[PDB]
Amino acid sequence: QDMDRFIDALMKKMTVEEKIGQLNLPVSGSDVAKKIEQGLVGGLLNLKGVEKIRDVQKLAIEKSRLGIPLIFGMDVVHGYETIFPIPLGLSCSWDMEAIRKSARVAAIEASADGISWTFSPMVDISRDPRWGRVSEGNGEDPFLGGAIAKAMVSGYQGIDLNNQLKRNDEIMACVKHFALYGAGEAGRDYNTVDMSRNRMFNEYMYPYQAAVDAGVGSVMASFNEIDGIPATANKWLMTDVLRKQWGFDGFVVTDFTGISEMIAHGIGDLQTVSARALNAGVDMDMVSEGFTGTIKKSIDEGKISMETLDKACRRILEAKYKLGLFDNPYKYCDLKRPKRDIFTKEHRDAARKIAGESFVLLKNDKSSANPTLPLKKEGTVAVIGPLANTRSNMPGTWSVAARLNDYPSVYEGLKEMMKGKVNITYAKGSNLISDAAYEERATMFGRSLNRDNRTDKEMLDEALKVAANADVIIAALGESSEMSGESSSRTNLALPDVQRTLLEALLKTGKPVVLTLFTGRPLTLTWEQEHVPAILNVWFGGSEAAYAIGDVLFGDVNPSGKLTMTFPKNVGQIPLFYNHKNTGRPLLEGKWFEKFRSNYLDVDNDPLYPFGYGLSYTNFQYSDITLSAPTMGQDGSVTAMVTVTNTGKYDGAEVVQLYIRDLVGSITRPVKELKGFDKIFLKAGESKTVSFKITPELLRFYDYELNYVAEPGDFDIMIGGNSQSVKTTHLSL
């Protein structure tokens, strides 16, 4: 109606070259202004500062023939300047409102600085902790993945589908990486992906669909091939699935240089592969110049229709309309806003809050028979390890707008907040890893630890001198932030060598030790789980991480996070995940080892920590399940409720999880699927009922012909505090 008629007239004034130019998305890198004057830039990524963005925008408005405004993109992944936990840690909060509010805040900060478009949320399902980009995602499960995709896009864009992007603090979200990028073979970033159509839809695709359903304005095509076709050239995925079946209405952008990397892939030259991508459904070309370089010749030669180009152009224009940018090219260019909106205390309070509700307590034995945690606010507490006094490694990877050198390290932030209460000391203890050249590439992008030439024994001795002065050791150990993220694959998931050696020495002091574990991925921790009294997985907490860790270790906040990705025992178990098929020879409960079952010779089938695992300072008690009927026909739905009681000594939160088992299928079904969850707070002593409505929709799945169906027969309804501790009841449809 309004939009259509307005874009109609604009497009009537546009040459074929100007339409192609709308598809072009370079970096800002005097240079770029010449392209804009010629009409060749549809948008810009990675320019920073509201004042520079406005100046570039004035060029498009006043010096291109047609005055079409630009989109301004950036990877706002878990914060602009206020830095939240890395997405993988954030997912462990299981707190959909807190996650939406973290996106709302990032949108407000980046919009204050002229950014209208973020390459986020990342929703790739991942079952392989070798892939460093698992830190950017939501874990292994497509139901939780879908809800979080929903929280992030609604936080970025607005909650009401029919009233998004209309505020100057709402920005366009970009869901990535369509698709299956998390199944890169052997955990190596960019590697081949291959899987059946059924596995895709039943296990990998839904979180993309949730983002589209949530209103996401853009989609990014992934680097990986699918069915032998790079995603950026896959008509089936970019048209049949994304548009025909899912009903997406925004535009598709490639990843960085996605188009020209298809040459490397092995499917042709730049003209050939640019036309395939445009014909596939790809709308916007990030840096490759494949569209600008070759579309007009391909149209000349009949390999692309004017129709195809006009669709892609209109989608670019439609996004700019929906953002409000024809109404006002400077909607996001308020030079006053960054002082009012960026790194405020209200933003930092909420990031610190959610950080301490995202950490995951994996162990809390004795080290006196009290649990080691929480810690008494007294005495002397030494913080020892390579991660104890580094500012730049606090935000996590993918924080390209952060102020790395400004945020407090663990040693600093605890010393400040416990001023007058606890004597906080420090020892580096060890390097990151004994391999210096590895430590260097693990600490790039400003994350150096300023590695010395001290022998491992020199730092070891210094740390034991300091630990003898202390009552409790906080071992700050694990990964550097850039040991995860893009192009950060590991074949080994252990605690690095010199750190584990430092750790045992600290355990040999007989003093209580709290492992404060920094990581972007599941790690292999069987030794730590056996020998270390207390273990808190702090992932990477963001810019406020030090204080949140102080909140949790000293009991000001009772930990409530739970794993959203499985923690295998060793690397040989990958992939290991909670929602697997039963197989025809399952190892039954307690039976490892049994010959001629599906198990290994040298380790049992179990993860170290299952999906949904998370301890608390307090314990929770579950009743059995109350179903409102045993069959579904009775009312078309049923209700499954339990009462959870806080039986310990601490007010605390508990993530109640709903699992379902389709017992008999026309194809093999998983042994459980997350189908619901509810995070509740309980005062010590109090109880509450948690109900879940079971609907026929909740039981659907893509059968062998890819029909989305619920089949009659029996289900097991389970509820509990992780995918291994559940009460069970029984329903049929």
Added chain:
Amino acid sequence: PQDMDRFIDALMKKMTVEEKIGQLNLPVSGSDVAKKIEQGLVGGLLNLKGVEKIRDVQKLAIEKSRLGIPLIFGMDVVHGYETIFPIPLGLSCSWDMEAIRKSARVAAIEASADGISWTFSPMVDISRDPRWGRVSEGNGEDPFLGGAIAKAMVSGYQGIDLNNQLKRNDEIMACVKHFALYGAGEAGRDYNTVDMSRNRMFNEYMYPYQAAVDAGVGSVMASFNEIDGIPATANKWLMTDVLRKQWGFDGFVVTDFTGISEMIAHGIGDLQTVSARALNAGVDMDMVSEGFTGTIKKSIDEGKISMETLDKACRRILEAKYKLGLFDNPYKYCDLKRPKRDIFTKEHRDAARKIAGESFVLLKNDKSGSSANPTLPLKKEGTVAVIGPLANTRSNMPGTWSVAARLNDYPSVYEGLKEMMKGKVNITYAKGSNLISDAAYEERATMFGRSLNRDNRTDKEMLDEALKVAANADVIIAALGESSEMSGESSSRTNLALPDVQRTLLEALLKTGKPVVLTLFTGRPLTLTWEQEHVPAILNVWFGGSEAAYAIGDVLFGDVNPSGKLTMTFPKNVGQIPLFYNHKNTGRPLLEGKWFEKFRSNYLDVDNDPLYPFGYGLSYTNFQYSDITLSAPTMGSVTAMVTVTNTGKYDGAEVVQLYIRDLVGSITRPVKELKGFDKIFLKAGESKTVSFKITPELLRFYDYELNYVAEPGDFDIMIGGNSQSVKTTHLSL
């Protein structure tokens, strides 16, 4: 060709429904099945050993059943009956199709002589996961090599003229297994889920089964794994669309052990329901499950199975027996004088020793200290100590899947060397270490009669004993690695290294200063970076079979020049799995020499390369290749020819391998694929010419639409001594 049909029509028109279902029944032996046979309810038996026992049982089916339909007697004769050839994986490393077909000929001659008419072999599952114990039973990761051996083996069992097979009483019906994809079990755990695209199936995994069908294989065995979420035994797309309609298979499909009933645990229904689905899918014979005898008639009465479907399955069982000549002579294989004539003769064992020697792979043979010469070949003098838990065990020599073998009768490494080297070398022994630290793990690793007699002794005592022998020897043969039952069925490892205590024993032996030859026993690729750096000489002896000790002497002391070449990639660590030679390029490939480069497809903690590539294997001599002469630059055919010259001091064989790379595809193509090979023998200083014929058919692949096509365009033709060091020339189609 109509005599068979008229005969089987006449027999089938006399059969009650029950007796037709009887023919479909394959129980194990245990009136051990004599009640069942008398009621006409047994189509064959498996694992009955003894020609006289088989003859008595068979006389029961002739004389005591109403119709006198004779039985087929099956057994897993995989790489030998009592003359044991190397395990298939080690056997595939010979690259000698003629010697491989002769190994099945010998096994068939021995197995028929003892009454067996039917072997479950060849196993042609492609695998790229060395965690899976069953790679020992296969042919490696490549489908062109695997298909040739499929043909070699089926021709060996049944006869070379596919139009004139099974007519002799020393030819037996083979069974290709396990159809299909059983080698892609997830996380390398046996029986676990398999999922992949239809495109990967046919370009990467499927051809060895078809090659066997084309070779005339009489029967086919459904695998344990699910495929597209349907267990292979219920998969009608697989068993009917692919196997018969597309490939033209004329024989019959048998299940693996209790395959049908294990579909209940798969989660696809009760015994009657899955039994009906399998017979409707194209499964003809039911191994032990009793699902066909238990439910088929009930399902016909209920209208879930047609008679025509039952008659189809029955007819193929009867055609199998006819083709074996069994109706005409039910006792064709029941000659009580044939055991002494045909089983474990000098001639058979000679051929086993020859091929074993020609299958071991020389992985490393560096000279050390002040030696003018490499350690191998050893000099026929002085004292050579054989040390390690594989040094003096007879029962572990055959390898896994030697069910008929005589575990006590085959010489251990120290005995064979001792007697063959009498009067030239003083051969001594020390156990050195247990197989592994965890005793419970050793007993699971040495079951099925493979005990090493673990003592009460401490590791130190055994080390002191070994080092005391070692100090009196001139050279040490470190006989280390796996027991036989650490591979095979249900023998997955999540750790692919040398066991802890053996590693320790090796390090002490290296520290003696005396030369050390690691003689590595194993049924799978191991991770050997430490050994590749610290051991001067390494020979992979896999498991050589009944004559392994004698062939180990042949090679170690020089009379045989090692010619084996790897058929499966050895990764540097488990974190690299899957790693294999025929992968896609990706869009961000790490170029040669570039590790580590950020934003390439590589790892942080290891480069992308295997420790030893596919087709790798050394010699005591050197082979040099001329450049490739192509008879024409563009595609009748074209001819690709090199000259190979033995430039070193010893006669020896060399596997010449041909690789082809399709440069641009409509889908991504592998960086190279084996397309030919040729094992030549060169006297020292001799040159020979090696020529391959490149036809369009050799360049066909399955495209996105699963059309089998060669696409015009450019090709790299390569010839070399392994998949990483090749001469290159260029062919255009």
